[PDB]
Amino acid sequence: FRKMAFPSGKVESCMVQVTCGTTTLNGLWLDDVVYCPRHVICTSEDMLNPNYEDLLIRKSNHNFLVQAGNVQLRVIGHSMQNCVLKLKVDTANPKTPKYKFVRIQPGQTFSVLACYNGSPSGVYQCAMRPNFTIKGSFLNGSCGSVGFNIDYDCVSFCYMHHMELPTGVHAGTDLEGNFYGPFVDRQTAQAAGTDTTITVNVLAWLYAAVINGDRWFLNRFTTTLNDFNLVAMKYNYEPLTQDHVDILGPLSAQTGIAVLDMCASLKELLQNGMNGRTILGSALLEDEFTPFDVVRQCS
Amino acid sequence: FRKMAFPSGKVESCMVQVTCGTTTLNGLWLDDVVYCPRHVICTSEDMLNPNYEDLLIRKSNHNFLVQAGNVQLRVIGHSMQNCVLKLKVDTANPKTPKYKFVRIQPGQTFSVLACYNGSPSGVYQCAMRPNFTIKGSFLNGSCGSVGFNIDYDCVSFCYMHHMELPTGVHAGTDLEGNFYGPFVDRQTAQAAGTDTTITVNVLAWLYAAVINGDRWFLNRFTTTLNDFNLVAMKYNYEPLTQDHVDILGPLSAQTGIAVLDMCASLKELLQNGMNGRTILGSALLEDEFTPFDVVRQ
Ligand SMILES: Cn1cnc(Cn2c(=O)nc(Nc3cc4cn(C)nc4cc3Cl)n(Cc3cc(F)c(F)cc3F)c2=O)n1
Ligand SMILES: Cn1cnc(Cn2c(=O)nc(Nc3cc4cn(C)nc4cc3Cl)n(Cc3cc(F)c(F)cc3F)c2=O)n1
């Protein structure tokens, strides 16, 4: 049981470089549109406090250099949708996959294709934290990198990377250009709200640990849903809903451990700590696996 | 600090499925040759004690079903090299990347493209353990999945997946079909050797912490390499090689911390513990990040 990302080939074929002046970052080339963060129109003075509509109206199509590998694409039009700039180019991407734009919910996961100057560099899994940040691995030049899920060869794009926060966590937008979270595309120190743990995911990962032959954390006790949620909230875990209990059904079915039995197990781990032991080789309670991620990998 | 796979597209367009009778697994299509585990020529009753020489003699080109998706690639020649079958097909793969076949050493990491019936399903980074297993994540139908590194658009293939072991770890070969470790391609109960901690990678991890300002564990001591190797084995850590000291060179230069000074630091952590302090926010020493991985991140 490992963190596993989707195969990234369908997305790699879509990554390009966008440059405006000296400012440069990654864009996503779908059919005859390149999507990228609007931040690319900013000079370094602009970045500190940008008025984007005002900066964009003073831009021309020829102010935009788009490179797909070694070839240049000619921008024939441009517009802005919230924090995303849409560059119309004169050539369709012939490797455009079947795709959708989706906005994911906190707790859901997606694969990140990290890119630098339009070249893909790595791929890994992230989750949308409950405070709408993600804990990724991004360096300078990764602006415009995208997150995505793939189901039956259709790519669902859900994240476009924008900035690193002072705490090292990451903030971005969906592909309509709305930020996840209360952030803005400005170069100024921004804090996130207090983060909490994705409870249903921790439960999924405990089930994974059982499917993989580890049970030291299980106990005899059971709890009620409300009594478990009291303890969870006390430890800054998100509440567990009855929908979450239902989503965990197959994993309870497969292992024969009732969900509220697993909750009783998690409750004790939260109160008594891990006492030095490890679950799936981790010393902390892992919360970036969804029930689907666990199912997809154990079956 | 995350485990990061290489982008997988160059390898995705090389994955095919190979079927013999009802036995089906994954193969790798490069130019006009498909490479796959020879275990594919086994029926159920052959997998326990297969006679690969006598099984290949009953076989003709027309016994091999090779498919890119649902498209058949006609097999025009077949031969065995160690534990991999090489199938000559009538079509050169137009998406063949610039590639090499390499044999990796324990501690080196690589990306695994897990596949089922010729269809990629996931990608993740693995380290080769000192007992020549990998802590993979593989389901049934993953035989023939490959592991790789990508350097400047060149794909270096280093691993082809064959089997899961009772302990739940995995074993395979290089792309010339030579197993890593003391395993053989039979459906027999084989046990991984006792594993050890990858010392060069723990050191890389310590350099990563120092680069990030987390350096409490640095001490005023130094050691010789032989002295350190003899003590590391007593804590079930791998001894360091001359090549290991050299790939730590860039990190040693970046931080100004001599490789042997960092060994003395680790030796002190081995003999006394972390005493309740963390390194990169962790109480445990990570050993699956190589020095190259550390600098890449
Ligand atoms: C350390 N880190 C982790 N993730 C990131 C992503 N990131 C980025 O890649 N680039 C940024 N600013 C730029 C500077 C440029 C210099 N040149 C020549 N071209 C540049 C292009 C960019 Cl985008 N930023 C900062 C940043 C980007 C934003 F989109 C934003 F709204 C606010 C910000 F403060 C950045 O975080 N770096
Ligand atoms: C759970 N798991 C994790 N890794 C693996 C890898 N693995 C595999 O995918 N398949 C195997 N045996 C086959 C059975 C088949 C049934 N049909 C219809 N077709 C089949 C093809 C194969 Cl390869 N094995 C077992 C195995 C494969 C070998 F190559 C070998 F030398 C010895 C072995 F015991 C397997 O481990 N499964």
DSSP string, B74-124: -EEEEEEETTEEEEEESS--TTPPSEEE-PPPTT-EEEEEEEETTEEEEEE
Q: Please tell me which residue in B36, B83, B126, B143 is annotated as part of the active site.
A: B143
Classify residue A29 by burial, with Cβ atoms within 10 Å: 0-12, 13-18, 19+.
Answer: buried
Spatial separation of the C-alpha atoms in residues A44 and A62, rounded to whole Å: 20
**For A39, phi and psi rounded to 5 degrees?**
-50, -25
| Secondary structure (DSSP) of B247-279 | HTHHHHHHHT--HHHHHHHHHHHHHH--TT--B
Candidate from B6, B10, B124 with C-beta closest to A4: B124
Spatial separation of the C-alpha atoms in residues A241 and A225, rounded to whole Å: 8
The CATH number of A10-89 is 2.40.10.10
Q: How close are the terminal C-alpha atoms of chain A, in Å?
A: 11
Sheet of A71-73, strands arranged across:
A71-73, A65-68, A15-20, A23-30, A33-37, A84-89, A75-81
Q: Residues in chain A, how many?
A: 299
Spatial separation of the C-alpha atoms in residues B258 and B248, rounded to whole Å: 9
- Name the CATH superfamily, with its identifier, for domain A199-298: main proteinase (3clpro) structure, domain 3 (1.10.1840.10)
- Helix axes of B259-272 and B225-232: crossing angle, nearest 10 degrees: 30
Does residue B143 carry a catalytic annotation?
A: yes
Q: What is the CATH architecture of B199-296?
A: Orthogonal Bundle (1.10)
Q: How far is CA B178 from the centre of its chain?
A: 13
Contact between residue A2 and residue A298 where contact means Cβ atoms under 8 Å apart: no
Helix (H) or strand (E) holding B149: strand B146-151
In chain B, the residue whose alpha carbon lies closest to the alpha carbon of A14 is: B9
Compute CA distances A236 → A25, A63, A108, A130, A271, whole Å. 36, 48, 18, 11, 12
Nearest 5°: the CA angle B271, B222, B292 is: 85
How many angstroms separate the CA of residue A156 from the nearest CA in chain B?
Answer: 16
Token pair belonging to A50: 């940008």
Token pair belonging to B77: 């020649």
Q: Which technique was used to obtain these atomic coordinates? A: X-ray
Test A6 with B122 for CB contact under 8 angstroms: yes
Spatial separation of the C-alpha atoms in residues B128 and B144, rounded to whole Å: 17
Contact between residue A262 and residue A285 where contact means Cβ atoms under 8 Å apart: no
Test A12 with B9 for CB contact under 8 angstroms: yes
Q: Please tell me which residue in B39, B161, B162, B244 is annotated as part of the active site.
A: B39
Token pair belonging to B245: 């000291």
Using a CB–CB cut-off of 8 Å, the residues of B that contact A are 1-10, 12-13, 113-114, 120-124, 135-137, 139, 168, 282-284, 296-297
Helix, strand, or coil (residue B141): coil
Contact between residue B240 and residue B228 where contact means Cβ atoms under 8 Å apart: yes
Helix, strand, or coil (residue B208): helix
Test A9 with B13 for CB contact under 8 angstroms: yes
Token pair belonging to A199: 């409870």
Contact between residue A165 and residue A158 where contact means Cβ atoms under 8 Å apart: no
Written in H, E and C, the secondary structure of chain A is: CCCCECCCHHHHCCEEEEEECCEEEEEEEECCEEEEEHHHHCCHHHHHCCCHHHHHHCCCHHHCEEEECCEEECEEEEEEECCEEEEEECCCCCCCCCEEECCCCCCCEEEEEEEECCEEEEEEEEECCCCCCECCCCCCCCCCCEEEEEECCEEEEEEEEEEECCCCCEEEECCCCCECCCCCCCCCCCCCCCCCECHHHHHHHHHHHHHCCCCCCCCCCCCCHHHHHHHHHHCCECCCCHHHHHHCHHHHHHHCCCHHHHHHHHHHHHHHCCCCCCECCECCCCCCCCHHHHHHHHC
In this structure, the number of other CB atoms found within 10 A of the CB of residue A22 comes to 7
Question: Which chain A residues are closer than 8 Å to B135 by Cβ?
Answer: 2, 281
DSSP state of B183: -
How many angstroms separate the CA of residue A242 from the nearest CA in chain B?
Answer: 30
Spatial separation of the C-alpha atoms in residues B280 and B292, rounded to whole Å: 18
Residues 6+ apart with CB under 8 A from A199: A232, A237, A238, A239, A240, A244, A266, A287
Question: Which chain B residues are closer than 8 Å to A120 by Cβ?
Answer: 7, 9
How many angstroms separate the CA of residue B219 from the nearest CA in chain A?
Answer: 26
Q: Which atom of ligand 1 has the smallest separation from the CA of A161?
A: 6
Residues 6+ apart with CB under 8 A from B158: B101, B102, B103, B104, B108, B110, B147, B148, B149, B174, B175
**For A52, phi and psi rounded to 5 degrees?**
-70, -40
Token pair belonging to A278: 């490890």
> Strand B146-151 and strand B154-164: pairing?
antiparallel
Spatial separation of the C-alpha atoms in residues B90 and B110, rounded to whole Å: 31
Test A2 with B136 for CB contact under 8 angstroms: yes
Candidate from A1, A123, A137 with C-beta closest to B123: A123
Helix, strand, coil percentages, rounded to 5, for chain B:
25, 30, 45
Question: Which chain A residues are closer than 8 Å to B123 by Cβ?
Answer: 4-8, 123
Contact between residue B64 and residue B50 where contact means Cβ atoms under 8 Å apart: no
DSSP state of B281: T
Spatial separation of the C-alpha atoms in residues A70 and B181, rounded to whole Å: 43
